[PDB]
Design a protein around this motif. Structure first.
Motif, mmCIF file in Angstrom:
data_model
loop_
_atom_site.group_PDB
_atom_site.id
_atom_site.type_symbol
_atom_site.label_atom_id
_atom_site.label_comp_id
_atom_site.label_asym_id
_atom_site.label_seq_id
_atom_site.Cartn_x
_atom_site.Cartn_y
_atom_site.Cartn_z
ATOM 1 N N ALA A 125 -0.603 0.596 -6.792
ATOM 2 C CA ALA A 125 0.387 1.813 -7.018
ATOM 3 C C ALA A 125 0.534 2.278 -5.469
ATOM 4 N N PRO A 126 1.685 1.999 -4.985
ATOM 5 C CA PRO A 126 1.955 2.271 -3.559
ATOM 6 C C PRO A 126 2.061 3.808 -3.564
ATOM 7 N N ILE A 127 1.696 4.258 -2.437
ATOM 8 C CA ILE A 127 1.990 5.794 -2.065
ATOM 9 C C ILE A 127 3.340 5.818 -1.414
ATOM 10 N N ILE A 128 4.030 6.754 -1.799
ATOM 11 C CA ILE A 128 5.353 7.052 -1.276
ATOM 12 C C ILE A 128 5.503 7.967 -0.277
ATOM 13 N N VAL A 129 5.969 7.748 0.919
ATOM 14 C CA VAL A 129 5.868 8.529 2.126
ATOM 15 C C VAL A 129 7.604 8.634 2.650
ATOM 16 N N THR A 153 3.689 4.961 -8.726
ATOM 17 C CA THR A 153 3.186 5.738 -7.597
ATOM 18 C C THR A 153 2.440 6.995 -8.127
ATOM 19 N N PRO A 154 1.279 7.148 -7.507
ATOM 20 C CA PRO A 154 0.393 8.365 -7.843
ATOM 21 C C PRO A 154 0.462 9.556 -6.820
ATOM 22 N N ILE A 155 1.133 9.108 -5.657
ATOM 23 C CA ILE A 155 1.120 10.197 -4.684
ATOM 24 C C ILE A 155 2.556 10.230 -3.696
ATOM 25 N N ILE A 156 3.031 11.146 -3.704
ATOM 26 C CA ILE A 156 4.379 11.347 -2.821
ATOM 27 C C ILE A 156 3.833 11.908 -1.540
ATOM 28 N N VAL A 157 3.959 11.596 -0.331
ATOM 29 C CA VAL A 157 3.732 12.549 0.817
ATOM 30 C C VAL A 157 5.105 13.030 1.503
ATOM 31 N N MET A 158 5.606 13.913 1.525
ATOM 32 C CA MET A 158 6.705 14.534 2.241
ATOM 33 C C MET A 158 6.493 15.374 3.523
ATOM 34 N N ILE A 159 6.993 14.811 4.735
ATOM 35 C CA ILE A 159 6.637 15.463 6.126
ATOM 36 C C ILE A 159 7.756 16.406 6.681
ATOM 37 N N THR A 160 7.297 17.621 6.670
ATOM 38 C CA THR A 160 8.605 18.656 7.132
ATOM 39 C C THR A 160 7.894 19.383 8.007
ATOM 40 N N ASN A 161 8.586 20.012 8.781
ATOM 41 C CA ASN A 161 8.195 21.392 9.917
ATOM 42 C C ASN A 161 8.775 22.782 9.334
ATOM 43 N N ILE A 162 7.850 23.417 8.778
ATOM 44 C CA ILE A 162 8.356 24.859 8.229
ATOM 45 C C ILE A 162 9.057 25.731 9.401
ATOM 46 N N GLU A 163 8.453 25.632 10.538
ATOM 47 C CA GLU A 163 8.830 26.525 11.584
ATOM 48 C C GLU A 163 10.374 26.243 12.163
ATOM 49 N N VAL A 216 0.799 -1.116 0.072
ATOM 50 C CA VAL A 216 0.126 0.147 -0.012
ATOM 51 C C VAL A 216 0.874 1.113 -0.011
ATOM 52 N N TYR A 217 1.713 1.303 0.730
ATOM 53 C CA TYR A 217 2.732 2.461 0.956
ATOM 54 C C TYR A 217 4.271 1.931 0.384
ATOM 55 N N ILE A 218 5.153 2.832 0.285
ATOM 56 C CA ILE A 218 6.626 2.722 -0.002
ATOM 57 C C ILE A 218 7.075 3.705 1.081
ATOM 58 N N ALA A 219 7.883 3.226 2.071
ATOM 59 C CA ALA A 219 8.641 4.351 3.074
ATOM 60 C C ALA A 219 9.944 4.326 2.581
ATOM 61 N N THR A 220 10.495 5.447 2.562
ATOM 62 C CA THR A 220 11.883 5.704 2.007
ATOM 63 C C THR A 220 12.687 6.903 2.764
#
Length: 272
Positions: free
Chosen positions: A201-205, A107-117, A83-87
């Motif tokens: 279609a795995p979601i990349i996170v 892959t149809p979706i990439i999710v990038m997890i950041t902190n702007i502060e 379901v996902y790819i963790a990279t």
């Protein structure tokens, strides 16, 4: 390792950090022993020499070094495969491998997890190409919680769409008041993923190492489905399942507690 939580116990559990740390540090990290990999030059592909992909679930790219990427297939709710790819966040020497993965996996979706502060750089201003994949940022959509880039991938006669979610509100303090934006992101991504229809279609996170924040996002996504379908959550079991797929998923107790805050918030929303 399972601790099924009803609504009332979920709300109290999220607010008991002494019980959470007791439970969380009992879960084995399941990190990979570096001896498992004997490839000269591999450390150039790894952001951290001790955060390695478990071999059984590693994403193999189409020479052992040229097929290597620090990425693992992650099962979703119910054990559904891929379901996902963790990279890891791509590094300069792996940016091309990353886009090769995106095209190879559809892959149809990439999710990038950041902190702007206060995690990488690999998306183009307008157009850039890597190993036969032309990336084109066609549109940008700024929200309070994330920036959504609509991207066109062109490799030959074939063209594909791609959604890149840049989450900007990853909190330094994992308190309940910082939960809504993560829950919003999880809900938006699963609706977008459902629009892709039946398709492997795995979601990349990712962020930096691909285990900490990445594990929180995937564990929350899984438990949201569990809550809707079963009326309960089992964060302990989910975390155990994630660690089987990739060692280290959910790295810190505050990350583990944050999943509980998010799920407590969601359960309240579903009751009202």
């Amino acid at each position: 390792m399972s601790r099924v939580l009803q609504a009332e116990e979920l709300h109290e559990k999220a607010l008991d950090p002494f019980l959470l740390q007791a439970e969380f540090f009992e879960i084995p990290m399941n990190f990979v022993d570096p001896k498992e990999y004997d490839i000269p030059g591999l450390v150039r592909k790894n952001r951290y020499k001790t955060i390695l992909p478990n071999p059984h679930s590693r994403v193999c790219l189409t020479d052992p070094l040229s097929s290597y990427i620090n990425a693992n297939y992650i099962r979703g709710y119910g054990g559904e495969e891929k379901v996902y790819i963790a990279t890891q966040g791509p590094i300069v020497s792996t940016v091309a491998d990353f886009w090769r993965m995106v095209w190879q996996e559809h892959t149809p979706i990439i999710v990038m997890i950041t902190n702007i502060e206060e995690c990488t750089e690999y998306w183009p201003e307008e157009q850039v190409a890597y190993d036969g994949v032309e990336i084109t940022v066609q549109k940008v959509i700024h929200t309070e919680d994330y920036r959504l880039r609509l991207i066109s991938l062109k490799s030959g006669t074939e063209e594909r769409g791609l959604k890149h979610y840049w989450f900007t509100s990853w909190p330094d303090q994992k308190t309940p008041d910082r939960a809504p934006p993560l829950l919003h992101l999880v809900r938006e991504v699963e609706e977008a993923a459902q629009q892709e229809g039946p398709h492997c279609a795995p979601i990349i996170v990712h962020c930096s190492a691909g285990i900490g924040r990445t594990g929180c996002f995937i564990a929350t996504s899984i438990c949201c489905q569990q809550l809707r379908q079963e009326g309960v959550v089992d964060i302990l079991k989910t975390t155990c399942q994630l660690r089987q797929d990739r060692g280290g998923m959910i790295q810190t107790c505050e990350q583990y507690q944050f999943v509980h805050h998010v799920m407590s918030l969601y359960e309240k929303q579903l009751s009202h």
